[PDB]
Amino acid sequence: SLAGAPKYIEHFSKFSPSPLSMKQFLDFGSSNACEKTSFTFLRQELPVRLANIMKEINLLPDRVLSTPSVQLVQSWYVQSLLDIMEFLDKDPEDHRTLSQFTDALVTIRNRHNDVVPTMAQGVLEYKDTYGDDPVSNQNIQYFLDRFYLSRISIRMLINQHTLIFDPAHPKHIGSIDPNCNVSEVVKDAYDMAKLLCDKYYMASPDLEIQEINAANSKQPIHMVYVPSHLYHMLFELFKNAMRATVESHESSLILPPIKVMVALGEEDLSIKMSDRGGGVPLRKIERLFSYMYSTGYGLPISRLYAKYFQGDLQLFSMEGFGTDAVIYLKALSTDSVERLPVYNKSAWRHYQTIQEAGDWCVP
Amino acid sequence: SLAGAPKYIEHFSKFSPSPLSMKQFLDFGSSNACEKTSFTFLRQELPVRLANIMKEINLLPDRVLSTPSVQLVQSWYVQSLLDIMEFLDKDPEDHRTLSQFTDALVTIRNRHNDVVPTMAQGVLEYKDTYGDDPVSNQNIQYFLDRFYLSRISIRMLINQHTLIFDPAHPKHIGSIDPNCNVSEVVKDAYDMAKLLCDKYYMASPDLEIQEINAANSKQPIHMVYVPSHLYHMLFELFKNAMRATVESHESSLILPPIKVMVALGEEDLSIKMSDRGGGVPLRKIERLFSYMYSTGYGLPISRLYAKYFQGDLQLFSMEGFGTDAVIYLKALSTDSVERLPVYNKSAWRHYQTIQEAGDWCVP
Ligand SMILES: O=S(=O)(c1ccc(O)cc1O)N1Cc2cc(O)cc(O)c2C1
Numbered sequence: 001s002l003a004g005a006p007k008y009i010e011h012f013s014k015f016s017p018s019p020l021s022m023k024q025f026l027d028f029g030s031s032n033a034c035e036k037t038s039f040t041f042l043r044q045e046l047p048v049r050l051a052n053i054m055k056e057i058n059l060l061p062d063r064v065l066s067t068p069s070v071q072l073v074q075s076w077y078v079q080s081l082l083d084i085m086e087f088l089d090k091d092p093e094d095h096r097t098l099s100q101f102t103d104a105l106v107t108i109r110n111r112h113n114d115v116v117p118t119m120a121q122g123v124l125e126y127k128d129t130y131g132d133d134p135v136s137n138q139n140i141q142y143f144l145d146r147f148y149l150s151r152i153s154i155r156m157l158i159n160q161h162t163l164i165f166d167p168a169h170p171k172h173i174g175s176i177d178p179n180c181n182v183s184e185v186v187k188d189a190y191d192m193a194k195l196l197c198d199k200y201y202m203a204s205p206d207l208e209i210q211e212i213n214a215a216n217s218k219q220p221i222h223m224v225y226v227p228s229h230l231y232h233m234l235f236e237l238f239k240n241a242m243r244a245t246v247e248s249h250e251s252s253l254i255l256p257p258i259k260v261m262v263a264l265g266e267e268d269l270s271i272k273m274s275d276r277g278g279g280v281p282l283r284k285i286e287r288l289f290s291y292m293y294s295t296g297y298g299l300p301i302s303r304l305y306a307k308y309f310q311g312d313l314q315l316f317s318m319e320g321f322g323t324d325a326v327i328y329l330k331a332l333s334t335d336s337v338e339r340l341p342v343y344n345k346s347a348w349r350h351y352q353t354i355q356e357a358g359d360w361c362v363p
Numbered sequence: 364s365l366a367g368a369p370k371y372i373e374h375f376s377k378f379s380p381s382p383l384s385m386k387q388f389l390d391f392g393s394s395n396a397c398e399k400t401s402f403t404f405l406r407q408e409l410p411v412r413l414a415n416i417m418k419e420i421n422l423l424p425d426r427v428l429s430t431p432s433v434q435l436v437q438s439w440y441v442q443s444l445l446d447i448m449e450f451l452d453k454d455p456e457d458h459r460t461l462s463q464f465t466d467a468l469v470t471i472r473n474r475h476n477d478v479v480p481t482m483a484q485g486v487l488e489y490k491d492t493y494g495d496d497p498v499s500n501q502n503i504q505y506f507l508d509r510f511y512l513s514r515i516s517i518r519m520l521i522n523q524h525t526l527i528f529d530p531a532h533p534k535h536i537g538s539i540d541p542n543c544n545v546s547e548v549v550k551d552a553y554d555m556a557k558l559l560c561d562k563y564y565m566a567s568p569d570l571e572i573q574e575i576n577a578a579n580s581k582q583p584i585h586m587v588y589v590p591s592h593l594y595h596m597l598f599e600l601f602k603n604a605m606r607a608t609v610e611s612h613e614s615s616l617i618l619p620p621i622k623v624m625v626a627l628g629e630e631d632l633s634i635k636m637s638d639r640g641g642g643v644p645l646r647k648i649e650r651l652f653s654y655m656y657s658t659g660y661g662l663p664i665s666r667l668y669a670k671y672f673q674g675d676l677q678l679f680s681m682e683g684f685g686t687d688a689v690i691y692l693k694a695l696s697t698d699s700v701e702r703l704p705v706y707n708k709s710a711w712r713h714y715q716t717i718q719e720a721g722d723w724c725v726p
């Protein structure tokens with residue numbers, strides 16, 4: 001009873017995704033009136049977001065698109081879009097519509113659970129089948145950043161709806177904590193990373209945390225954020241910092257600690273993790289965020305989580321000494337706005353590159 | 364007796380500049396035989412470098428190219444190219460050729476002494492005459508990085524020739540010190556910056572230096588480098604770090620020191636300058652390297668000096684606390700290779716951009 005998927009994809013890809021702020025997410029209520037509004041919003045917005053990214057998948061090199069794992073992920077997106085199309089003519093006033101809608105979103109979330117490693121298998125299939133080439137590699141890098149950020153945003157919308165309209169912390173709004181204690185999340189991530197480090201190395205660096213609350217020196221630092229995302233970033237950073245520290249100190253019984261500073265400024269909430277794990281030459285930094293070289297998407301996905309609400313995650317090393325990693329977040333919920341890729345001329349132009357000599361000299 | 368400048372520009376712009384390594388610069392001798400070789404090399408290479416960048420000047424927006432200061436700089440480049448064309452048919456075996464050539468290079472260097480602020484006046488003329496627009500601004504940013512790096516490389520070639528073939532430190536090869544003591548340059552830059560800070564604020568932060576020589580912990584860190592370039596970068600960084608520190612501490616008599624770490628690894632020699640000057644939000648970092656917003660090209664030019672021998676200069680702040688600046692240099696003279704822009708299809712494509720919506724969403 002549905003139209004062919006391409007007809008829906010073309011229709012919805014004409015719209016731009018609509019970025020929401022953390023404050024907008026937070027201010028959304030839980031009444032039946034609010035549930036109807038979420039329904040009518042999401043039966044438009046989710047198809048817009050699904051269609052936009054599906055259109056970019058089609059711009060990938062034939063080589064990457066031809067891989068079975070990429071085709072598999074594509075087929076999931078198609079079915080998920082069609083699942084939502086079933087709701088276009090349904091009455092929001094009917095309670096069964098709303099309950100059925102929530103069930104459909106859960107089914108979609110589950111269907112897409114393994115998207116990240118499935119796409120990674122696609123990248124490997126491309127490399128194995130054809131060998132890699134720099135042009136395709138740049139396109140893959142550009143696309144995957146956008147694809148995975150898209151996915152993060154779709155999961156955010158779905159989680160907010162299912163959590164609110166279907167508990168450990170009742171004070172949270174869906175997955176959002178209006179009073180996230182940053183140092184507590186740092187400690188939780190450290191604890192879990194230490195378990196792993198201790199298992200493999202029988203030792204781990206200690207943690208030291210310092211807070212700089214610029215405007216209110218005595219006050220513990222809190223923010224509006226999704227604690228699971230913050231935890232994810234910190235856990236990945238701790239794993240890298242711990243491994244560097246232990247491996248660079250094979251001979252020592254004394255390990256330098258990992259030092260974390262949490263700073264709260266007027267605009268930024270910044271978290272720096274400093275290790276003395278011997279560092280890495282500058283030349284090798286970019287590789288850490290590469291889907292190719294690391295095909296372990298922990299660091300690039302962590303940086304996407306940071307970028308998702310207008311933040312960033314940056315690494316600066318001193319070879320021979322150690323490495324600083326900094327998570328930059330927006331301090332204010334009103335500045336914390338979804339960063340969403342959009343399918344348009346500008347996007348389309350990025351996949352329209354070819355092999356040639358660079359604009360810089362080689363000997 | 365010369366052809367029209369465009370005929371020479373077209374001829375020489377077909378070649379790519381030839382990047383030399385620090386080791387190649389260093390290994391060049393001072394005999395009459397070596398002077399002839401430098402002559403025959405430079406009467407080709409300097410025209411290639413002049414022509415390549417002149418071709419890119421022509422790709423600038425009409426608006427920027429139409430400014431009197433940009434046209435003035437263009438006219439200097441034309442005359443300098445023609446000055447060298449006078450030497451195409453001259454005999455390297457004739458001592459007068461060589462002496463005349465050195466005189467011509469000195470005249471060129473002097474002619475171009477004020478290129479940096481003259482171009483900056485061009486940018487201001489563009490802004491005043493037309494108002495600025497984002498497309499032109501991006502083109503200006505791209506071009507100026509390349510133009511000023513080009514200029515650095517041309518001045519390097521000229522200085523090496525005139526210094527070698529026409530002293531405080533006789534151990535230097537032209538402007539290159541094969542045994543540059545990095546901490547000594549840090550101290551020299553600090554001393555000069557402190558003079559300025561003390562003049563205006565009647566106080567300045569102290570300096571602390573720590574060295575990490577990974578492979579040889581006891582040994583003072585030395586490298587092959589051009590000390591004036593290193594001094595330039597450190598002086599600019601100290602001025603910023605000092606101003607931040609004093610201005611963020613208006614009420615205090617105790618100023619936090621500026622801490623410098625010099626680390627020597629297998630591949631990198633890294634110099635970190637850390638201040639507690641209160642920092643800056645991430646949003647405002649990019650502006651520091653902008654020719655537009657800072658129209659004070661101290662930071663962007665400093666970063667070009669770092670990039671010139673395959674290094675970099677990076678800033679990471681923690682708003683509410685302070686800022687780290689890191690100069691990344693190649694530890695090895697063989698890795699220290701000129702980074703030279705080249706005029707080709709790839710370069711040409713960058714000026715072929717236009718106004719449109721970005722590939723990312725706006726609310
Ligand atoms: O690149 S690192 O500087 C680094 C990268 C990311 C990060 O968040 C922290 C880091 O120290 N590091 C050095 C090293 C040495 C090892 O022996 C094993 C490692 O996993 C590593 C990792």
Ligand SMILES: O=S(=O)(c1ccc(O)cc1O)N1Cc2cc(O)cc(O)c2C1
Binds near residue numbers: 607638640688
């Ligand atoms: O951007 S900063 O963090 C900075 C930029 C570059 C650098 O090398 C060091 C820095 O601290 N800094 C803060 C601030 C406050 C002032 O009142 C005056 C200043 O000049 C500044 C400069």
